Design a protein around this ligand. Structure first.
Ligand SMILES: Nc1nc2c(ncn2[C@@H]2O[C@H](COP(=O)(O)OP(=O)(O)OP(=O)(O)O)[C@@H](O)[C@H]2O)c(=O)[nH]1
Ligand SMILES: Nc1nc2c(ncn2[C@@H]2O[C@H](COP(=O)(O)OP(=O)(O)OP(=O)(O)O)[C@@H](O)[C@H]2O)c(=O)[nH]1
Ligand SMILES: Nc1nc2c(ncn2[C@@H]2O[C@H](COP(=O)(O)OP(=O)(O)O)[C@@H](O)[C@H]2O)c(=O)[nH]1
Ligand SMILES: Nc1nc2c(ncn2[C@@H]2O[C@H](COP(=O)(O)OP(=O)(O)O)[C@@H](O)[C@H]2O)c(=O)[nH]1
Ligand SMILES: [Mg+2]
Ligand SMILES: [Mg+2]
Lengths: 432, 430, 432, 430
């Protein structure tokens, strides 16, 4: 199968990316030194070399030298090509303007140079994977630059993105409403579909299901690796009814703006706890249609589903998949939209998930991941617009952004654009 | 990479400076001679943030020490830790300021200020990315206010974009070690509001309270209060020196903690602060650590946050800490004390975690709070300023050193507006 | 045969349930570790797994963490799925209002989640077994919640319940009249039939027949396990004239309200004493029609039988069963109601009762259990209504219940409902 | 899980408190230093009910010790067992109460009460499920009544739902260690009836009787009476700490033992109470154990139950005991003494069994009885109160500390109604 590029932006992207590439090395049995022990699958994410040392086909960018420096000196130092790890001199300071107008453009061209040199060295290219955070300067301002630049030079190629959408209540910053909304305004027209995830939801699942009281980002990012691994498994491992990268956008994006399918995964069970469970196909399948198992803390029952992609993994009997999916279609609580009778997309690969050494989650013989697109997510956008309106009403933090070469009206346009997004979701939630 | 240059002025500044480098040198395992003997490699990876280097391993901390009389600096030089500073950095005069702001700002600081910039610029061009300057002084005195405000104004002109944070001692609410503190303090505030990006208002009286109340140690005043201050300021700059899950920065806190340009006077807090004898009777878990940050018992400012409302709050944790607990407790704090936070800002807490703890501990956190209760402090200074100025209490000393009483009115009028602005943000939405 | 779920509520239910599942493991030879030694019967009460460790199909709920914690750390810790053992934070304090209105509803939804996930994983489901106590807050207030909830989501499915009806004279609490009557008002319309048992009667039998002077709840609950095992034996072991779970309600419930068949068992003989006995079929059969062998201290001779189910066990000659039953029908002292000429229901299974290691009762080759429904039980209800009227007449304890979100009129309605129950029993006792 | 926080006020409270933790620490095998050395795992499973934890195994009992003069507390601190308490919990004043209720309730307790809540709340938010508070004081004194009633009133406002049981010493019927006991006691009762969920009235005179009558030990008064009291209160809270066949709880007893809100003053009893020399001449079976609970010989209150009628009765047995014997004997008691129980309550006995016995025994039981005979006690206090108040015996001391004689009339009128209410429940049904 053909290659796919991964672009990791900001502290969230870089830190999350390291978790992902630990899994890939384990799936293909690649040593952390880069040298495979003494096949055709890894070509999609790994580039060959005359020696036995394969090179990951990813690029890391961060305006702050601190985060990447840990990778550059860690046990994966020899895995990455030294020029891929791009580092700036000063952080964006949780400022959208800095990472998008003043300092973001100083290093944007350097990143493109490595993307082009890496994109040109593949006969075919499915698209780009992009990891970033709405609640940062680099992960929100610099990302918007790449989305725009990657839309012109490589237009009409897939651009999938996993994003850390701001949590409903918890918050590790103060300017999340301003920064998060601004990037959504610019990334709406320059993206295919965004796989939102909330740290609040992942923390809740970790304490609720994984049964560990004291998690950390090093733990959550490993869970986030699973959804990426299952999503991209079809591009590496053989299996009946493989799902390509470009198939997600067609199935999960009815309209250009409505491209926010929240992520879900199953089963998340601790090693000891799993011995008391059966893990049948319906069990894992029905575990993804409850508001207690979501990576974004939104209640699906509040809204309506309008598209769902199921990417089954491991030793799966598709007959059971057909039966399990049929049952979910005939439950009153589960509610799909009126104008989408055909609201599922199945995918199976014969490769059970791998367990990172010392990992928390168990060695499941079978797993499933869902990418449902639900109008209940409009609640999150409305809440974010509400928080944004509270601050900008008094003009409480704009002086930081205006001084960074950002026009005043951008905030006005940003909210108005999100206002239309709310109405667009509302109309889709009804029937004509 | 993100270099910081340290400035210390006045008698208070140098002594705080002096104990500021005894702490950092301990974190990086730097011998008083300047020779590295640490154990962990991370110490060297960012040792260039504060310390320059000379062949043979001699690490030179780029501090700039300035005072108008050799007295205090000679003590630092003769100190056990005085062998580390570059002799060229000490900028000493020959006629110290007599606590009158005008002399240290117009007639005497003017003669010595040009020499200091000649030493800052060398430490400024020796850094590949200079992040911002750091300044430690006292508003009450003459040298920490006169020349400190004169110097901070100058470095603002050349380096408008760079950060410039100030750890400044503020006159105590009821006790006073100087008679002209209102005149000196009032002029200093009128001069910082326009130049300093962030100020950390602290006062001895509140910091005294920590010594006997939460700790149980009556003997020391200045050898230890400075050490609490040094630990606080070290916490703020930790993210630029050690790896962290959520790395912070002087610019990150400014943006989060400064809604409006003229509202940048915070009030720090540090934890844990336990006595040696009662330490074994206490848990070191995250929840308890976070409880004492928001109580007026552990606030290094004289102003009680209860009388006012928080505008923005920043926490900088350290050590191996569970980020879930680091975040659940803050949500808990906001809801429990919903009346202590303004509604027109949906979220008021900023978090940052560093992996490496401070020396001698496995957990720590530095609180930085922007509360409207700080307006009481300026309000109080104005009450004292107007009373003395209403009869020209001491203006003759200040007028005779190249100054005009019109400046005092401007300093009082500008101060009055700062108090008024903080007062506007007591009302709720709509 | 098809599955049946067990729901254990309150300290009585949890403590009684542990006694039951000790028997089931012994009957099927399942190790306490959960792993069967190195077949189709256990599927009704045990769920299979990829490994050899079967999982009991039961749920334990208790508002007080203390009782279940003993199970969670006992020798059966590895037998139960960790999520089945549901525990609250504070006890209901022998208060019907707390376990039904304020604290009961805080954890009721959690129990349903495990019931649904366990009820959905069975192709067929006979019904639910429910163990509780009238004289508790959790066992009376929280139970009523489940009976109501289990009546809607799973209506038209069997709901059998074994209950610790308040003893006539002995009492381990002071508010039994208030609490016991309240649940009866709510559980009358949301239950099939309740198998009442009194600790006073069981204690009397234990000292009278088992010949041990110092019993304990750990001993009585083992006796209560036998009636459950014999009742459900037809669903596990082969035998002529098997009796299904839903057959009890049809035979023993002439009218919707009259569904209180008191339990009886035979033989209860000590190991040493049994060597001097023959244990013929009529002997054990005639031992169940005397007021000295009942689990509820009520005299059948005072009232009249109106339905009886006999569940014989072990090597039984049904011809003897037919002869023995016929004799009981032709005794003047034994008196059935006029309008029920056909007043018996036989059931046989080829599986002799098993002896718990270190148990008191002997290894009987044959046994019988009766579920007779008698109008003599109306005496117990009248006595309970009498005790209730004494207290509520002076309004002696209502302030505890009113402060727990309970309207005053509930006591008035509760007694009036029980008053009609007395008249309903009275009419059935005569002939038109 | 079901956490209890302990409060002890006054000289009597602390000493009872002090011997209250020497018993519990013995049950859980906790060394005076706070280090666990027990043998059975059940001790740790619920050690969090009373003891918090600090790294290294140091278990901190959350007691709050408050008194208006350092005298008594300094003895506890210097005690062998004083090293366990958290130094921050001791709340000590500098001017003790002179046995006048007003000073410890209006002028002096008011100044110190705010400090105590700052220590309760920390122990309150450190518990995941806080069941209820516990309080030990004396009505006769000034600190155990003034501030004790002031504190119990405050914790009622913040924690209305939580349980709050009181083990309180009541003035003796004929002997008195203070002259103003009626004034202090009368005001205290008027203030508890509205706030305390359950009160355990005990008096030294009755408890003296146990020492020489059923035991044979004349030497000690306060070192041992407190130990009988400590064992009694430990029995009440055993179900929350160890497994039991029929687990009980502070709320379970309140519901069973409190028919009406204003009738919550019980009178405890404990068994077995045998002398060391006569112990070998006695059986330890359940029947005999139960006989002595209902005799006025083993009642820790001065009021004899024979003169009145029981309203509700609770037994909390311990150890491996046959529940049939535990229940047959109670049915026996009710029938034998049918005149001692009110008819309008069909059943008056509540039973609870714990598997683990108290240290040094294999069987035990704590009696808790609500009898109308306790009205004699309040009736007696009123007779004494009205006699002194009829001529203003000592009102000038109380009026001069921020108080009014109208409050005394209210306290006498409210007390008179409590006596009247208990009297209504002497008549039979119809
Ligand atoms: N899941 C996950 N989220 C992270 C991780 N690190 C940071 N985040 C999220 O990132 C959000 C803020 O954006 P950051 O990534 O920290 O900031 P940035 O992208 O580096 O941009 P700057 O502010 O210029 O540093 C926080 O709210 C975190 O929730 C991580 O390792 N895993
Ligand atoms: N047969 C039997 N009966 C029991 C057992 N344990 C408790 N009971 C009965 O339960 C009755 C009181 O109800 P409980 O179960 O104790 O109280 P609860 O259901 O836990 O409700 P709470 O009061 O909130 O704790 C007592 O009168 C006992 O007769 C047991 O192990 N076996
Ligand atoms: N924290 C701290 N404050 C000090 C110290 N020495 C002086 N101060 C404060 O500084 C003020 C005096 O300022 P000073 O430096 O003497 O004036 P100047 O040097 O002439 O500008 C007093 O109000 C002191 O509270 C010290 O060692 N530590
Ligand atoms: N059981 C017991 N009672 C005590 C003890 N010490 C004092 N008391 C009682 O407490 C009363 C005196 O109260 P006190 O604490 O001295 O008054 P206060 O502290 O000023 O409020 C006397 O009636 C004593 O009977 C003791 O060690 N044990
Ligand atoms: Mg960053
Ligand atoms: Mg219970």
């Amino acid at each position: 199968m053909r290659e796919c590029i991964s672009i990791h932006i900001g502290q969230a992207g870089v830190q999350m990316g390291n978790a992902c590439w630990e899994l890939y090395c384990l799936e293909h049995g690649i040593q952390q030194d880069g040298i495979i022990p003494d096949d055709s699958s890894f070509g999609t994410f790994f580039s060959e070399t005359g020696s036995g040392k394969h090179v990951p086909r990813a690029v890391f960018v961060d305006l702050e030298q601190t985060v990447i420096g840990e990778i550059r000196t860690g046990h994966y130092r020899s895995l990455f090509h030294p020029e891929q790890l791009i580092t700036g001199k000063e952080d964006a300071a949780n400022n959208y303007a800095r990472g998008h107008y003043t300092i973001g453009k100083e290093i944007v061209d350097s990143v493109l140079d490595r993307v082009r040199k890496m994109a040109d060295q593949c006969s075919g290219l499915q698209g780009f994977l992009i990891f970033h955070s709405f609640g940062g300067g680099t992960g929100s301002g610099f990302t918007s630059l790449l989305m725009e630049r990657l839309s012109v030079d490589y237009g009409k190629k897939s651009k999938l993105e996993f994003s850390v959408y701001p949590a409903p209540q918890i918050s590790t910053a103060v300017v999340e409403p301003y920064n998060s909304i601004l990037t959504t305004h610019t990334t709406l027209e320059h993206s295919d579909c965004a796989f939102m995830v909330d740290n609040e939801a992942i923390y809740d699942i970790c304490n609720r299901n994984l049964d560990i009281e004291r998690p950390t980002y090093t733990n959550l990012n490993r869970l986030i690796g699973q959804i990426v691994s299952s999503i991209t498994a079809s591009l590496r491992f053989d299996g009946a009814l493989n799902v390509d990268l470009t198939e997600f956008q067609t199935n999960l994006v009815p309209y250009p703006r409505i491209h926010f399918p929240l992520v879900t995964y199953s089963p998340i069970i601790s090693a000891e706890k799993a011995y008391h469970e059966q893990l049948s196909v319906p069990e894992i399948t029905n575990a993804c249609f409850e508001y207690s198992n979501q990576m974004v803390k939104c209640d699906p029952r509040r809204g309506k589903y309008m598209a769902c992609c199921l990417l089954y993994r491991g030793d799966v009997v598709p007959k059971d998949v057909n039966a399990a999916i049929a049952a979910i279609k005939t439950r009153r609580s589960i509610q799909f939209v009126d104008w989408c009778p055909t609201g599922f997309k199945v995918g199976i690969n014969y490769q059970p998930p791998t367990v990172v050494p010392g990992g928390d989650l168990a060695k499941v013989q079978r797993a499933v991941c869902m990418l449902s697109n639900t109008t209940a997510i409009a609640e999150a956008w409305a809440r974010l617009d509400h928080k944004f309106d509270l601050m900008y009403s008094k003009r409480a933090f704009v002086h930081w952004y205006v001084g960074e070469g950002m026009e005043e009206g951008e905030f006005s346009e940003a909210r108005e654009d999100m206002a239309a997004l709310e109405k667009d979701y509302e109309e889709v939630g009804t029937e004509s | 990479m993100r270099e910081i240059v340290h400035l210390q002025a006045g008698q208070c500044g140098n002594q705080i400076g002096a104990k500021f480098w005894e702490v950092i040198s301990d974190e990086h395992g730097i011998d008083p001679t300047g020779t590295y003997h640490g154990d962990s490699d991370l110490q060297l990876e960012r040792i260039n943030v504060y310390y320059n280097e000379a062949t043979g391993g001699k690490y030179v901390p780029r501090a700039v020490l300035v005072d108008l009389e050799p007295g205090t600096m000679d003590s630092v030089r003769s100190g056990p830790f005085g062998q580390i500073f570059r002799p060229d950095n000490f900028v000493f005069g020959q006629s110290g300021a007599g606590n009158n702001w005008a002399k240290g700002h117009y007639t005497e600081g003017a003669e010595l200020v040009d020499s200091v910039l000649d030493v800052v610029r060398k430490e400024a061009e020796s850094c590949d990315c200079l992040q911002g300057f750091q300044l430690t002084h006292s508003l009450g005195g003459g040298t920490g206010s006169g020349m400190g405000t004169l110097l901070i104004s100058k470095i603002r002109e050349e380096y408008p974009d760079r950060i410039m944070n100030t750890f400044s001692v503020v006159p105590s609410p009821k006790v006073s070690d100087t008679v002209v503190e209102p005149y000196n303090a009032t002029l200093s505030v009128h001069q910082l509001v326009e130049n300093t990006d962030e100020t950390y208002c602290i006062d001895n009286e509140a910091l005294y309270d920590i010594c006997f109340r939460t700790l149980k140690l009556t003997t020391p005043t200045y050898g230890d209060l400075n050490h609490l201050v040094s630990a606080t300021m070290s916490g703020v700059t930790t993210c630029l020196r050690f790896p962290g899950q959520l790395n912070a920065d002087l610019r990150k806190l400014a943006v989060n903690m400064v809604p409006f340009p003229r509202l940048h006077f915070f009030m720090p807090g540090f934890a844990p602060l336990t006595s040696r004898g009662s330490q074994q009777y206490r848990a070191l878990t995250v929840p308890e650590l976070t409880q004492q940050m928001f109580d007026a018992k552990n606030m290094m400012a004289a102003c009680d946050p209860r009388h006012g409302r928080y505008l923005t709050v920043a926490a900088v944790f350290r050590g191996r800490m569970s980020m879930k607990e680091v975040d659940e407790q803050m949500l808990n704090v906001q809801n429990k004390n919903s009346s202590y936070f303004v509604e027109w800002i949906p979220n008021n807490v900023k978090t940052a975690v560093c992996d490496i703890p401070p020396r001698g501990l496995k957990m720590s956190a530095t609180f930085i709070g922007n509360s409207t209760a700080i307006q009481e402090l300026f309000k109080r200074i104005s009450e004292q300023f107007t009373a003395m100025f209403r009869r020209k209490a001491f203006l003759h000393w200040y007028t005779g050193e190249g100054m005009d009483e019109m400046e005092f009115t401007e300093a009082e009028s500008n101060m009055n507006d700062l108090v008024s602005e903080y007062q506007q943000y007591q009302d709720a939405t709509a």
